[PDB]
Design a protein around this ligand. Structure first.
Ligand SMILES: *[C@@H]1O[C@H](CO)[C@@H](O[C@@H]2O[C@H](CO)[C@@H](O[C@@H]3O[C@H](CO)[C@@H](O)[C@H](O)[C@@H]3O)[C@H](O)[C@H]2NC(C)=O)[C@H](O)[C@H]1NC(C)=O
Ligand SMILES: *[C@@H]1O[C@H](CO)[C@@H](O[C@@H]2O[C@H](CO)[C@@H](O)[C@H](O)[C@H]2NC(C)=O)[C@H](O)[C@H]1NC(C)=O
Ligand SMILES: *[C@@H]1O[C@H](CO)[C@@H](O[C@@H]2O[C@H](CO)[C@@H](O)[C@H](O)[C@H]2NC(C)=O)[C@H](O)[C@H]1NC(C)=O
Length: 403
C-alpha cells in the first residue's frame, strides 16, 4: 500500500480519541490567519517568508498521537474543524491524497522536497499505528535521538539532516542551544522548492534601481525587467495582482503590489482566502511590462510562542498535553518542547534557486504603446502556489530586497 494507493480504511480509526478540495480550503484559512498575526507582530521594513503548508502538514502528522483537548486545540487552530463532515481521521486520508500529488517524482520541471520530522528522546516509544501512518501519509520518521546525554550531538544531527534535504540552503533549523537534556519532543519541518521561470528574465536587462521602503527612505535593488504575456488584474483600491508561472504551469508565483498611496500593512489586514480567490478569478492574460527585483529571503521560526497565543496550549504543556501515541516508562508528562520551521527563497532571472545566465533575444516585436506596467519598487506580497491543488505552498513579504 503506497501513498497514492492508500484507501480510506488504510488510514485507521483512532485509539480512544475544476473541483476544489475541502482540505486545501482549511489550509488556506490557517495560512491567512497565521500570516496576519505574524505580520502584525513584525516591523514593516522586515521581510517575511514561511511555508504554511509545511506547518499545517507537520501538525496534522503530530495529531495522530494526540487526544482530547490537545487534539481539539490542534483541529481548531489549523482550521481542520471547519472541514464540514466531522471525522478527524479523514484529514490524514485527505493529506495522503494531497501529499501524493504534491511530492511526485514526475519530470515536473520544479522540485518540491518535504522535510517533516518529529524527534523524541530515546526513552520514548512511539505507538506502532502512529509510526505506520506518519510514514505512509506524511513520509515522516518518528526519530529517536539521545537528548539526555548527547543534546548538542542531536542538534547538530538535526541541523545536518535538514541541510541535506534543502541542498545546504538551510543549515540551522534549530537555533543554538534550544535543545538540552530536558528536551523530550521536537517537531522540525521545512519545504524546499526549486523551479525555472516559464518566461525567464535576462540578466543583461537587470539594472540598479531604487526601492522605496516603508520607513520613507530608499535603497538600491537589482531590478529585473522583461515584457510578455502574463495573467494580471488591477483590483480594489489600486492593487496590482500578477501571476508569474514556473515551467510546467502547476506551480506559479503571485505578487500583490499595492498602489504607492496604500500601505502594505493595510493589504495584509484585508487578506482573506476568499478575497484572494476573487482576485485570481479576475486575472487575464495581458501583454505587459514587468519590473521586479532580485530578492533572497531566509526566515527561521520557533513556532510555540505564536501557536500558543492562537490557542495551541495543551500540546506544549507537561500537565495538560494528552499524547497517547508517545509513551515512556514512568512518565506522564510527554509534551512538545518546540516546533522549528525555516524557509528559504532566492529569486533571480532564471527562477527559484537556479543561478544561470540565460540571455534573451526577442526579434521583430512591437508592443502596444499604452501597455500596462508593473514596477515592484515598493513592498509587495509573494505567494508560491500549486494551481491544480489550490494550495498555498509558501507565502511571504518582500519589504526590503536591497543589498
Ligand atoms: C542525503 O539524503 C539522501 C536521500 O535522498 C541520501 O541518499 C541515500 O544514501 C543511502 C546511503 O546512506 C543510499 O543507500 C544505498 O543503498 C544501497 C542498496 O543496498 C547500498 O548498497 C549502498 O551502500 C547504500 O546503503 C541511498 O541509495 C541514497 N538514496 C536514497 C534515495 O535513499 C544521502 O546519503 C544523504 N546524505 C548523507 C550524507 O547521508
Ligand atoms: C498503541 O495504541 C493502542 C491503543 O489504541 C494500544 O493497544 C492497547 O494494547 C493493550 C495490550 O496490547 C490492550 O490492553 C489495550 O486494550 C489496547 N488498546 C486498544 C484500544 O486496542 C497499543 O499498546 C499502543 N502501543 C504501545 C506502544 O503501547
Ligand atoms: C479523552 O476523551 C475520551 C473520549 O474519546 C474519554 O474517554 C471516555 O472515557 C470514559 C471513562 O473513562 C468512558 O465512559 C467513555 O466511553 C470514553 N470515550 C467515549 C467515546 O466517550 C477520556 O475520558 C478523555 N480524557 C482523557 C484524559 O483521556
Amino acid at each position: 500500500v503506497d501513498i497514492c494507493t492508500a484507501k480510506p480504511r488504510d488510514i485507521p480509526m483512532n485509539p480512544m480519541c475544476r473541483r476544489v478540495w475541502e482540505l486545501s480550503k482549511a489550509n488556506s484559512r490557517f495560512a491567512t490567519t497565521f500570516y496576519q498575526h505574524l505580520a502584525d507582530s513584525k516591523n514593516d521594513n522586515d521581510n517575511i517568508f514561511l511555508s504554511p503548508l509545511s506547518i499545517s502538514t507537520a501538525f496534522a502528522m503530530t495529531k495522530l498521537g494526540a487526544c482530547n483537548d490537545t487534539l481539539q486545540q490542534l483541529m481548531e487552530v489549523f482550521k481542520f474543524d471547519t472541514i464540514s463532515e466531522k471525522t478527524s481521521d479523514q484529514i490524514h486520508f485527505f493529506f495522503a491524497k494531497l501529499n501524493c500529488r504534491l511530492y511526485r517524482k514526475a519530470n515536473k520541471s520544479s522540485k518540491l522536497v518535504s522535510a517533516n520530522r518529529l524527534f523524541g528522546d530515546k526513552s520514548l516509544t512511539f505507538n506502532e499505528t502512529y509510526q505506520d501512518i506518519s510514514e505512509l501519509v506524511y513520509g515522516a520518521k518518528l526519530q529517536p535521538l539521545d537528548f539526555k546525554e548527547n543534546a548538542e550531538q542531536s542538534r547538530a544531527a538535526i541541523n545536518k539532516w535538514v541541510s541535506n534535504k534543502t541542498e545546504g540552503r538551510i543549515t540551522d533549523v534549530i537555533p543554538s542551544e534550544a535543545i538540552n537534556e530536558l528536551t523530550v519532543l521536537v517537531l522540525v519541518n521545512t519545504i524546499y522548492f526549486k523551479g525555472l521561470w516559464k518566461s525567464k528574465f535576462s540578466p543583461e536587462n537587470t539594472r540598479k534601481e531604487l526601492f522605496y521602503k516603508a520607513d520613507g527612505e530608499s535603497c538600491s535593488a537589482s531590478m529585473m525587467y522583461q515584457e510578455g504575456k502574463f495573467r494580471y488584474r488591477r483590483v480594489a483600491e489600486g492593487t496590482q495582482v500578477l501571476e508569474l508561472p514556473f515551467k510546467g504551469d502547476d506551480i506559479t508565483m503571485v505578487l500583490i503590489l499595492p498602489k504607492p498611496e496604500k500601505s502594505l500593512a493595510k493589504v495584509e489586514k484585508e487578506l482573506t482566502p476568499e478575497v484572494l480567490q476573487e482576485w485570481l478569478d479576475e486575472l487575464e492574460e495581458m501583454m505587459l511590462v514587468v519590473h521586479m527585483p532580485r530578492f533572497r529571503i531566509e526566515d527561521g521560526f520557533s513556532l510555540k510562542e505564536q501557536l500558543q497565543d492562537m490557542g495551541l496550549v495543551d500540546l506544549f504543556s507537561p500537565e495538560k498535553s494528552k499524547l497517547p501515541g508517545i509513551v515512556a516508562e514512568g512518565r506522564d508528562d510527554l509534551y512538545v518542547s518546540d516546533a522549528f520551521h525555516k524557509a528559504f527563497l532566492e529569486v533571480n532571472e532564471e527562477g527559484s534557486e537556479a543561478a544561470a545566465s540565460t540571455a534573451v533575444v526577442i526579434a521583430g516585436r512591437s508592443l502596444n504603446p499604452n501597455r500596462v506596467t508593473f514596477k515592484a519598487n515598493r513592498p509587495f506580497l509573494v505567494f508560491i502556489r500549486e494551481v491544480p491543488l489550490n494550495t498555498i505552498i509558501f507565502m511571504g513579504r518582500v519589504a526590503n530586497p536591497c543589498v
